């Protein structure tokens, strides 16, 4: 049976050509994912204290 | 027919005033270097001196006396037959490499 | 299912060239142009010229460039070899059946119409220092060069490999002239295998017609007596001791060739003790060490050598050579039963049939005869030739060895290795 | 080149014959 | 007639099987001499850590007097009848065979049966062959060509049977008892595991009568156990670097995991190895040679020799190359070699593949000339492939191969694979394994 | 002899997927490669995220500032 | 011949890149 990680190797990153396409697209998604997550974590850490939380107040 | 201009241009070129034949002034490359390497001792050691003397002239900003100038009629094409063969062998290698 | 064997056809042209083809119906072809050209036909001046010519087979020809020869043959999976003896040069091409005319074309271009360009020959000069040094690792080789050198005077004393001083000194003009003199109709012989006869004849008429001086025959294998003893500082002590045997054409050659097999010719059983070998058993009972001895037999169209080769330690060589020599002298005096000869004949005629088994050895045997005689004599007649050798001929051959002038060559630590006069 | 077993057969079987080629390695037969 | 017709008109090999288990095979021709012999699935891979070197000893003792023909009677009888007797041991295949006259066929088959079945194994003679093997192991120690290949096996197949040398360690040679040899013989030397091959001018019916009359005395199965069957060997990408500056030239052997005898890919891999080819400093072509590795190696004078090999075994092998070079030329040779592998994996011209095919076409027909190579081919084929493969079937598989097949197959076995590397000699320049492993895929 | 040389035991250092010496590695090979090359790729992605931000910030300083944008 | 799928894939790799930072 084709395994979990071998299935990635075989079709996604055996060639160095696709290796880069994976990294680029993965990095494109990672940026959206990580920023969004770490923003939300920082915003939950600092709840009510930032402008975006008290913006509806004066607008 | 127009050998005249071929003769005029030869004289107008001016390498003959330095005592050089046409094939002494050829720009070296991989083919020419190889053709020059294939030259027999006499023609090699001659072009060596012809060039060595022509550079010595070019240093001093002078030319030879008019009788010592190279003649369009007596300008031997010593390098050609070798250089033709080197080129033809390279063309053959490329035509074989094509397939 | 067994297929039918076809006759080896044979044609000899008016200009003198010998032709022979065998329609094998084989997958592969095997064509050879044998020439009376070799180490012997060099002289005092132009030495090692056959050696450089042997090496130069892929250099630029008049019809094909060096690049075209190499790549054209390799692209069809073929291979062009040259095999020199002292007498004969055997230019041989091998390929698939559909690529014959191509290899033939290159073969003819190399053998009839080479250019020998000054720069190409100059570029090739150091290869013969390599090719020599490669073969001379086998000390057999150098002892045999020294043997022939010391045994003969002018003709066969020429070394097969180029003399060390002549490395670099062989000219393109000497090659030109050495080809023009020797690579000629009466001296050449085109052999074929896995090929039709008419095309091989027509090609041999169309291209292989050229004739110049020399015209077959030859000079003189002036036999002499000599000893050259090269102090080596080696592990072993390689040596050889011979006398003038018979030339290849006579029944005496077969007597010497049988006598070789009566004596220790060369082992048949892997990791055996050399049982039926005479010389090995004679020396083994005498001295108890690691050694080897064997009967050496060279036969040419002009002359021949016969005797034995000894390999041993520093001190053992003295005993080994004497004990082997005495075992030749005990046969020469006449102690020889009929079963010994009848075994030896069976060993020889089997070994001959085995030598002609592979098509390479077959072609070399057809090409041997095409030059040597100008004819072909099939195996069965050679079997009869062997079986017809009398016991008296074996005793006379063995006696001619002991009585005749001696030629020695040794290399090793020779402190306890004897001279010829000490024998 | 140590024992007598392997040392058998190395004694000169016939006059040396030098073969050179385009493809095949250069050999010295007999 | 043409090459394709000649292949079809070649004599068809024929095989019969005895009731006791032995396979009997033959190739008939119009020649008068013939080769006949016995091939056995026995050797180093079947041996174990206790009895490593058994197959070699047995080969050493084989031709010394049999139980019915003592001392050197067998030796005298074979020699006096104008014939040759020979043997060898591969890691997977031991074999004895006689080259003889066709007339001599019955006696040859009898003496083979005598060697195999009833071997003496004299105790005084074991003590002498002990020293002979101990000499021969020092004779192999000086041969750098063999040492580097035994190391390649040792590191490629580490911790498995194939890692073992066929000759065996000096300690086993010093302590191998007659009990081990006889038990190894009784186990492995048997009818269903054996093949009787023949080739020359001889009638298949007659060979089968001789095999029935002499070889049917062999046992035909086991004691219900003791039947050893080959466990597959683990290939390990790894390195062994016997650093020795005193020796003149560095020997390097690099290889990736092989296909195994059964795999059709072998044909495309032979074509592949034919394209890269092989070189020696005595070659004529030099700078104009077809294979770029040889051309580059000849022009620059990188190496003394190189040779691409595909060593095959039951379910695995060693696909790679070997080279001998000056201590300052190892990195370069390695770079050109791997460069050629990577190139062939990714880009392969139709022309060079046709050259690769034709080299292999010529190789097959060149090799099967004379009786001994054909008798070997039969005896080996029946142990490995199961049947004899005709030259027409080979040609079908060669003609099958084109450029795309070579690329798909080369890239399958070579590209991004850990290779087994073996270095012996002045190997200070031999590239680091990470750098070699980096060279096993490309920049792309 | 040189046949005395056996390769020492790497069973300590080996991965779990290649420990059985009776087993062909080829089935595990693609997984073993895929695991290691994933680490590398994941690292390259993580650096690529960083590198983009670092560069973009320096580029933004070179761009028009707040006080110029204010009084424009 | 053989570098067409490679150069296309690298052409894609480069393309998204210009999207990557900008
Ligand atoms: C090697 C890099 C190692 C990782 C460095 C961690 C910081 C990388 C990173 O992405 O940090 C966040 C980034 C800004 O993120 P946000 O505030 O959300 O702004 C909008 C983002 N589009 O700021 C930084 O940390 C950049 C600092 C880079 C330091 C590296 C300097 C390299 C020197 C050579």
């Amino acid at each position: 049976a084709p395994t979990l990680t071998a299935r990635l190797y075989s079709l996604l990153f055996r060639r160095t050509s696709t290796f880069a396409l994976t990294i680029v697209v993965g990095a494109l998604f990672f940026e959206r994912a990580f920023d969004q997550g770490a923003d939300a974590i920082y915003e939950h850490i600092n709840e009510g204290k930032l402008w975006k939380h008290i913006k509806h107040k004066y607008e | 027919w127009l050998e005249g201009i071929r003769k005029w241009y030869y004289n107008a070129a001016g390498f003959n005033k330095l005592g050089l034949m046409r094939d002494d002034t050829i720009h070296e490359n991989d083919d020419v270097k190889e053709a020059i390497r294939r030259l027999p001792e006499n023609l090699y050691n001659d072009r060596v001196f012809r060039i060595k003397r022509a550079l010595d002239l070019s240093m001093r900003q002078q030319i030879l006396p008019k009788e010592q100038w190279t003649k369009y009629e007596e300008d031997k094409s010593y390098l050609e037959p070798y250089l033709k063969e080197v080129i033809r062998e390279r063309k053959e290698r490329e035509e074989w490499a094509k397939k | 299912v067994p297929p039918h064997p076809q006759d080896l056809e044979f044609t000899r042209l008016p200009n003198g060239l010998v032709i022979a083809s065998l329609e094998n119906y084989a997958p592969a072809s095997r064509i050879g142009l044998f020439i009376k050209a070799g180490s012997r036909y060099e002289n005092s001046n132009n030495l090692g010229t056959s050696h450089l010519l042997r090496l130069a087979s892929s250099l630029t020809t008049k019809g094909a460039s060096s690049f075209k020869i190499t790549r054209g043959i390799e692209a069809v999976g073929g291979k062009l070899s040259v095999t020199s003896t002292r007498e004969n040069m055997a230019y041989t091409v091998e390929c698939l059946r559909d690529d014959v005319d191509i290899l033939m074309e290159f073969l003819l271009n190399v053998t009839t119409a080479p250019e020998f360009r000054r720069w190409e020959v100059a570029a090739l000069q150091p290869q013969l220092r390599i090719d020599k040094a490669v073969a001379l690792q086998n000390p057999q080789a150098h002892v045999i060069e020294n043997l022939h050198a010391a045994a003969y005077r002018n003709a066969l004393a020429n070394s097969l490999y180029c003399p060390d001083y002549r490395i670099g000194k062989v000219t393109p003009v000497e090659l030109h002239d050495y080809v023009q003199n020797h690579f000629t109709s009466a001296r050449m012989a085109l052999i074929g295998l896995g090929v039709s006869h008419p095309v091989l004849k027509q090609v041999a008429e169309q291209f292989l017609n050229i004739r110049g001086g020399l015209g077959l025959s030859g000079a003189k294998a002036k036999y002499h007596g000599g000893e050259i003893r090269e102090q080596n500082g080696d592990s072993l002590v390689h040596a050889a001791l011979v006398a003038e045997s018979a030339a290849i054409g006579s029944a005496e050659a077969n007597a010497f060739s049988v006598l070789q097999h009566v004596l220790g010719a060369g082992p048949h059983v892997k990791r055996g003790s050399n049982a039926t070998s005479s010389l090995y058993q004679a020396v083994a009972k005498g001295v108890h060490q690691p050694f080897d001895v064997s009967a050496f037999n060279a036969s040419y169209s002009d002359s021949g050598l016969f005797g034995f080769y000894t390999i041993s330690q520093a001190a053992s060589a003295g005993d080994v050579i004497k004990a082997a020599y005495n075992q030749v002298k005990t046969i020469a005096q006449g102690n020889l039963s009929n079963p010994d000869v009848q075994a030896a004949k069976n060993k020889l005629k089997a070994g001959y049939l085995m030598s002609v088994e592979s098509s390479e050895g077959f072609l070399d045997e057809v090409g041997s005869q095409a030059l040597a005689a100008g004819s072909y004599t099939p195996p069965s007649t050679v079997l009869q030739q062997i079986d017809a050798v009398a016991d008296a001929d074996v005793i006379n051959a063995a006696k001619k060895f002991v009585s005749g002038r001696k030629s020695m060559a040794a290399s090793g630590n020779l402190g306890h290795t004897p001279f010829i006069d000490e024998l | 080149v140590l024992c007598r077993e392997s040392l058998r057969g190395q004694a000169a079987g016939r006059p040396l014959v030098a073969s050179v080629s385009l493809n095949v390695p250069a050999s010295v037969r007999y | 007639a043409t090459y394709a017709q000649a292949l079809q008109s070649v004599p068809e090999t024929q095989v019969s099987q005895l009731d006791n288990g032995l396979r009997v095979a033959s190739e008939q021709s119009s020649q008068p001499t013939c080769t006949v012999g016995v091939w056995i699935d026995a050797g180093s891979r079947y041996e174990s850590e206790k009895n490593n070197g058994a197959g070699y000893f047995v080969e050493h003792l084989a031709f010394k007097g049999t139980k019915n023909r003592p001392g050197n009677a067998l030796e005298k009888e074979v020699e006096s009848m104008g014939a040759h007797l020979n043997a060898y041991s591969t890691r997977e295949h031991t074999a004895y065979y006689i080259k003889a006259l066709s007339k001599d066929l019955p006696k040859a088959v009898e003496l083979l049966a005598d060697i195999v079945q009833n071997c003496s194994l004299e105790d005084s003679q074991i003590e002498k062959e002990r020293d002979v093997i101990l000499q021969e192991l020092q004779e192999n120690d000086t041969s750098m060509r063999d040492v580097v290949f035994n190391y390649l096996h040792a590191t490629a197949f580490q911790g498995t049977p194939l890692a073992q040398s066929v000759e065996g360690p000096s300690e086993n040679v010093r302590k191998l008892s007659r009990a081990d040899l006889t038990e190894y013989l009784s186990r492995h030397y048997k009818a269903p595991r054996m093949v009787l091959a023949a080739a020359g001018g001889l009638e298949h019916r007659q060979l089968l009568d001789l095999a029935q009359k002499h070889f049917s005395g062999l046992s035909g199965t086991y004691d219900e156990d003791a039947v050893p069957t080959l466990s597959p060997c683990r290939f390990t990408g790894s390195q062994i670097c016997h650093r020795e500056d005193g020796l003149p030239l560095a020997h390097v052997a690099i290889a990736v995991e092989g296909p195994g005898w059964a795999h059709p890919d072998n044909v495309a891999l032979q074509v592949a190895n034919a394209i890269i080819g092989h070189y020696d400093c005595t070659y004529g072509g030099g700078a104009h040679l077809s294979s770029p590795l040889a051309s580059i190696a000849a022009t620059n004078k990188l190496c003394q020799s190189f040779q691409t090999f595909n060593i095959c075994y039951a379910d695995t092998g060693l696909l790679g190359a070997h080279f001998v070079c000056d201590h300052m030329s190892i990195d370069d040779m390695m770079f050109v070699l791997q460069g050629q592998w990577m190139r062939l994996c990714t880009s392969a011209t139709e022309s060079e593949v046709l050259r690769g095919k034709n080299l292999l076409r010529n190789a097959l027909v060149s090799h099967l000339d004379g009786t001994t190579p054909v008798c070997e081919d039969i005896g080996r084929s029946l142990l490995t492939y199961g049947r004899r493969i005709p030259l027409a079937e080979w040609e079908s598989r060669i003609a099958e191969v084109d450029a795309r097949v070579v690329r798909e197959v080369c890239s399958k076995y070579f590209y991004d694979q850990c290779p087994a590397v073996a270095g012996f000699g002045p190997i200070e320049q031999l590239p680091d394994y990470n750098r070699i492993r980096s060279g096993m895929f490309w920049l792309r | 002899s040189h046949t005395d040389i056996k390769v020492p035991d790497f069973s300590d250092y080996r991965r779990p997927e290649v420990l059985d010496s009776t087993k062909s590695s080829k089935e595990s090979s693609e997984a073993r490669k895929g695991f290691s090359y994933l680490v590398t790729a994941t690292t390259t992605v993580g650096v690529a995220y960083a590198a983009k931000n670092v560069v973009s910030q320096f580029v933004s300083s070179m761009s028009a500032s707040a006080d110029v944008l204010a009084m424009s | 011949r053989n570098w067409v799928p490679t150069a296309q894939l690298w052409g894609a790799v480069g393309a998204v890149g210009l999207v990557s930072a900008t």
Side-chain angles (χ1 to χ4, degrees), chain E residues 239 241-252 325-331 423-433 436:
Chain E
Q239 199 159 231
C241 287
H242 193 151
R243 181 65 183 282
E244 169 50 28
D245 289 354
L247 273 48
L249 298 169
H251 298 167
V252 180
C325 65
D326 180 55
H327 73 100
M328 297 302 302
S329 308
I330 302 159
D331 198 344
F424 179 39
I427 59 158
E428 195 168 67
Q429 203 179 77
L430 185 66
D432 189 80
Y433 194 88
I436 293 165

Short mmCIF file of all heavy atoms in Angstrom, two decimals, chain E residues 239 241-252 325-331 423-433 436:
data_model
loop_
_atom_site.label_atom_id
_atom_site.label_comp_id
_atom_site.label_asym_id
_atom_site.label_seq_id
_atom_site.Cartn_x
_atom_site.Cartn_y
_atom_site.Cartn_z
N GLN E 239 28.54 3.56 2.39
CA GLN E 239 29.91 3.71 1.88
C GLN E 239 30.94 2.94 2.70
O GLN E 239 30.77 2.75 3.91
CB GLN E 239 30.28 5.19 1.83
CG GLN E 239 31.47 5.50 0.93
CD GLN E 239 31.52 6.95 0.49
OE1 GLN E 239 31.64 7.25 -0.70
NE2 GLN E 239 31.42 7.87 1.45
N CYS E 241 35.32 2.97 2.75
CA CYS E 241 36.46 3.73 2.23
C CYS E 241 37.76 3.22 2.81
O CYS E 241 38.28 3.77 3.79
CB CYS E 241 36.27 5.22 2.56
SG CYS E 241 35.02 6.04 1.55
N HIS E 242 38.28 2.16 2.21
CA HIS E 242 39.58 1.62 2.58
C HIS E 242 40.66 2.58 2.08
O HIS E 242 41.12 2.48 0.94
CB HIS E 242 39.77 0.20 2.03
CG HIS E 242 40.94 -0.53 2.63
ND1 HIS E 242 40.98 -1.90 2.74
CD2 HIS E 242 42.11 -0.08 3.16
CE1 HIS E 242 42.11 -2.27 3.30
NE2 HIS E 242 42.82 -1.18 3.56
N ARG E 243 41.05 3.51 2.95
CA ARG E 243 42.09 4.48 2.65
C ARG E 243 43.45 3.80 2.68
O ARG E 243 43.85 3.25 3.71
CB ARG E 243 42.03 5.63 3.66
CG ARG E 243 43.06 6.74 3.46
CD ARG E 243 42.86 7.50 2.15
NE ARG E 243 43.90 8.51 1.96
CZ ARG E 243 43.95 9.70 2.56
NH1 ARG E 243 43.00 10.09 3.42
NH2 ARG E 243 44.96 10.52 2.31
N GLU E 244 44.16 3.85 1.55
CA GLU E 244 45.49 3.24 1.42
C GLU E 244 46.30 3.97 0.35
O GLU E 244 46.22 3.65 -0.84
CB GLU E 244 45.35 1.74 1.12
CG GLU E 244 46.62 1.00 0.71
CD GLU E 244 47.81 1.22 1.63
OE1 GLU E 244 47.61 1.48 2.84
OE2 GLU E 244 48.96 1.13 1.15
N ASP E 245 47.08 4.96 0.79
CA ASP E 245 47.87 5.80 -0.12
C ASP E 245 49.06 5.08 -0.77
O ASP E 245 49.50 5.49 -1.84
CB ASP E 245 48.36 7.06 0.60
CG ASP E 245 47.24 8.06 0.89
OD1 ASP E 245 46.09 7.85 0.45
OD2 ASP E 245 47.52 9.07 1.56
N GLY E 246 49.57 4.03 -0.12
CA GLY E 246 50.68 3.25 -0.65
C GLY E 246 50.44 2.62 -2.01
O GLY E 246 51.37 2.50 -2.82
N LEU E 247 49.20 2.21 -2.27
CA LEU E 247 48.82 1.64 -3.56
C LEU E 247 48.74 2.74 -4.63
O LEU E 247 48.41 3.88 -4.31
CB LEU E 247 47.49 0.86 -3.46
CG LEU E 247 47.60 -0.61 -3.05
CD1 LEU E 247 48.49 -0.82 -1.82
CD2 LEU E 247 46.21 -1.19 -2.83
N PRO E 248 49.05 2.40 -5.90
CA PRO E 248 49.26 3.42 -6.92
C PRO E 248 48.00 4.12 -7.44
O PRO E 248 48.04 5.33 -7.67
CB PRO E 248 49.93 2.64 -8.06
CG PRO E 248 49.37 1.27 -7.93
CD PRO E 248 49.13 1.04 -6.47
N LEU E 249 46.91 3.38 -7.61
CA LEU E 249 45.70 3.92 -8.24
C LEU E 249 44.45 3.61 -7.42
O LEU E 249 44.27 2.49 -6.97
CB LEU E 249 45.53 3.34 -9.64
CG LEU E 249 46.64 3.66 -10.64
CD1 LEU E 249 46.49 2.80 -11.89
CD2 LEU E 249 46.67 5.14 -10.99
N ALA E 250 43.60 4.62 -7.27
CA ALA E 250 42.34 4.49 -6.54
C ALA E 250 41.33 3.73 -7.36
O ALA E 250 41.16 4.00 -8.55
CB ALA E 250 41.79 5.86 -6.19
N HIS E 251 40.67 2.76 -6.72
CA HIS E 251 39.59 1.99 -7.34
C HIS E 251 38.29 2.36 -6.64
O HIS E 251 38.21 2.34 -5.41
CB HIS E 251 39.84 0.48 -7.22
CG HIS E 251 41.07 0.02 -7.94
ND1 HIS E 251 41.63 -1.23 -7.75
CD2 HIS E 251 41.88 0.66 -8.80
CE1 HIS E 251 42.69 -1.35 -8.52
NE2 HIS E 251 42.90 -0.20 -9.13
N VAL E 252 37.29 2.73 -7.44
CA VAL E 252 35.99 3.14 -6.92
C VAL E 252 34.94 2.28 -7.61
O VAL E 252 35.03 2.02 -8.80
CB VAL E 252 35.73 4.64 -7.20
CG1 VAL E 252 34.37 5.07 -6.66
CG2 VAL E 252 36.85 5.49 -6.61
N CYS E 325 41.53 5.11 -11.31
CA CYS E 325 42.09 6.41 -11.69
C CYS E 325 43.15 6.96 -10.74
O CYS E 325 43.33 6.46 -9.63
CB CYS E 325 40.97 7.44 -11.87
SG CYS E 325 40.07 7.83 -10.35
N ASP E 326 43.85 7.99 -11.22
CA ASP E 326 44.80 8.76 -10.43
C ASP E 326 44.08 9.43 -9.27
O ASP E 326 42.91 9.81 -9.40
CB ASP E 326 45.48 9.81 -11.32
CG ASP E 326 46.49 10.66 -10.57
OD1 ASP E 326 47.41 10.09 -9.95
OD2 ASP E 326 46.37 11.91 -10.61
N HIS E 327 44.78 9.58 -8.14
CA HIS E 327 44.18 10.11 -6.90
C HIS E 327 43.60 11.53 -7.00
O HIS E 327 42.75 11.90 -6.19
CB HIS E 327 45.18 10.03 -5.74
CG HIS E 327 46.30 11.02 -5.81
ND1 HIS E 327 46.31 12.19 -5.08
CD2 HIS E 327 47.45 11.01 -6.52
CE1 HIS E 327 47.42 12.86 -5.34
NE2 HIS E 327 48.13 12.17 -6.22
N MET E 328 44.05 12.31 -7.99
CA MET E 328 43.50 13.64 -8.27
C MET E 328 42.35 13.66 -9.30
O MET E 328 41.88 14.75 -9.66
CB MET E 328 44.61 14.58 -8.75
CG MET E 328 45.71 14.84 -7.72
SD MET E 328 45.14 15.54 -6.16
CE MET E 328 44.34 17.05 -6.70
N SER E 329 41.88 12.50 -9.74
CA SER E 329 40.86 12.41 -10.80
C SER E 329 39.53 11.80 -10.35
O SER E 329 38.64 11.58 -11.18
CB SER E 329 41.42 11.59 -11.96
OG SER E 329 42.68 12.08 -12.38
N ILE E 330 39.37 11.55 -9.05
CA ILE E 330 38.22 10.79 -8.53
C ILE E 330 36.95 11.64 -8.56
O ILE E 330 35.91 11.18 -9.04
CB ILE E 330 38.47 10.26 -7.09
CG1 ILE E 330 39.72 9.37 -7.04
CG2 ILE E 330 37.26 9.46 -6.61
CD1 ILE E 330 40.31 9.23 -5.65
N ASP E 331 37.04 12.87 -8.04
CA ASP E 331 35.91 13.81 -8.04
C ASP E 331 35.38 14.06 -9.45
O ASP E 331 34.17 14.04 -9.68
CB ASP E 331 36.33 15.14 -7.39
CG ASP E 331 35.13 16.00 -6.94
OD1 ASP E 331 33.98 15.76 -7.36
OD2 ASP E 331 35.36 16.94 -6.15
N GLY E 423 35.29 2.29 -2.04
CA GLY E 423 36.55 2.93 -2.44
C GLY E 423 37.75 2.26 -1.79
O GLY E 423 37.79 2.09 -0.57
N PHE E 424 38.72 1.86 -2.61
CA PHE E 424 39.98 1.27 -2.14
C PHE E 424 41.17 1.90 -2.86
O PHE E 424 41.18 1.97 -4.09
CB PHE E 424 39.95 -0.25 -2.34
CG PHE E 424 41.22 -0.97 -1.90
CD1 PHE E 424 41.91 -0.59 -0.74
CD2 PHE E 424 41.69 -2.06 -2.62
CE1 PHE E 424 43.05 -1.26 -0.34
CE2 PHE E 424 42.84 -2.74 -2.22
CZ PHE E 424 43.52 -2.34 -1.08
N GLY E 425 42.16 2.35 -2.09
CA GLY E 425 43.37 2.97 -2.63
C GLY E 425 43.57 4.40 -2.13
O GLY E 425 43.05 4.75 -1.07
N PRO E 426 44.33 5.23 -2.88
CA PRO E 426 44.52 6.64 -2.51
C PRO E 426 43.27 7.46 -2.79
O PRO E 426 43.18 8.15 -3.81
CB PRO E 426 45.71 7.07 -3.38
CG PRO E 426 45.59 6.21 -4.59
CD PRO E 426 45.11 4.89 -4.08
N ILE E 427 42.32 7.38 -1.86
CA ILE E 427 40.95 7.90 -2.07
C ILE E 427 40.63 9.13 -1.21
O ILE E 427 39.49 9.30 -0.76
CB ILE E 427 39.90 6.78 -1.84
CG1 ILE E 427 39.98 6.21 -0.41
CG2 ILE E 427 40.07 5.67 -2.86
CD1 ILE E 427 38.71 5.53 0.05
N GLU E 428 41.62 9.99 -0.99
CA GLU E 428 41.40 11.23 -0.24
C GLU E 428 40.44 12.17 -0.96
O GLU E 428 39.70 12.92 -0.31
CB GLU E 428 42.72 11.97 0.02
CG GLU E 428 42.60 13.05 1.09
CD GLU E 428 43.94 13.57 1.54
OE1 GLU E 428 44.64 14.22 0.73
OE2 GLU E 428 44.31 13.34 2.72
N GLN E 429 40.44 12.13 -2.29
CA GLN E 429 39.56 12.97 -3.09
C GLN E 429 38.13 12.42 -3.21
O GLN E 429 37.22 13.19 -3.53
CB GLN E 429 40.15 13.19 -4.48
CG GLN E 429 39.63 14.45 -5.15
CD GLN E 429 40.24 14.67 -6.51
OE1 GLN E 429 39.86 14.02 -7.48
NE2 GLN E 429 41.18 15.60 -6.59
N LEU E 430 37.94 11.11 -2.98
CA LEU E 430 36.63 10.47 -3.14
C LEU E 430 35.54 11.30 -2.47
O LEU E 430 35.60 11.49 -1.25
CB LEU E 430 36.63 9.05 -2.57
CG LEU E 430 35.35 8.22 -2.78
CD1 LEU E 430 35.12 7.92 -4.25
CD2 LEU E 430 35.44 6.92 -1.99
N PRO E 431 34.57 11.83 -3.26
CA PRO E 431 33.59 12.77 -2.70
C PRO E 431 32.83 12.23 -1.49
O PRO E 431 32.64 11.02 -1.36
CB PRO E 431 32.63 13.01 -3.86
CG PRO E 431 33.44 12.77 -5.07
CD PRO E 431 34.37 11.65 -4.71
N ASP E 432 32.40 13.14 -0.63
CA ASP E 432 31.61 12.79 0.55
C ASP E 432 30.29 12.16 0.11
O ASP E 432 29.76 12.49 -0.96
CB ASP E 432 31.34 14.03 1.39
CG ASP E 432 30.70 13.69 2.72
OD1 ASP E 432 31.43 13.27 3.65
OD2 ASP E 432 29.47 13.84 2.84
N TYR E 433 29.77 11.25 0.93
CA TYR E 433 28.54 10.53 0.59
C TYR E 433 27.35 11.46 0.36
O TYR E 433 26.55 11.21 -0.54
CB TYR E 433 28.17 9.49 1.65
CG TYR E 433 27.13 8.53 1.14
CD1 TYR E 433 27.50 7.38 0.46
CD2 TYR E 433 25.77 8.79 1.31
CE1 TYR E 433 26.55 6.49 -0.02
CE2 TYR E 433 24.81 7.91 0.83
CZ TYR E 433 25.20 6.76 0.17
OH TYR E 433 24.25 5.89 -0.31
N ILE E 436 27.88 12.76 -3.08
CA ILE E 436 27.54 11.67 -4.01
C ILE E 436 26.02 11.51 -4.08
O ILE E 436 25.45 11.41 -5.17
CB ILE E 436 28.20 10.33 -3.61
CG1 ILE E 436 29.72 10.43 -3.78
CG2 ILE E 436 27.68 9.17 -4.45
CD1 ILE E 436 30.52 9.34 -3.10
#
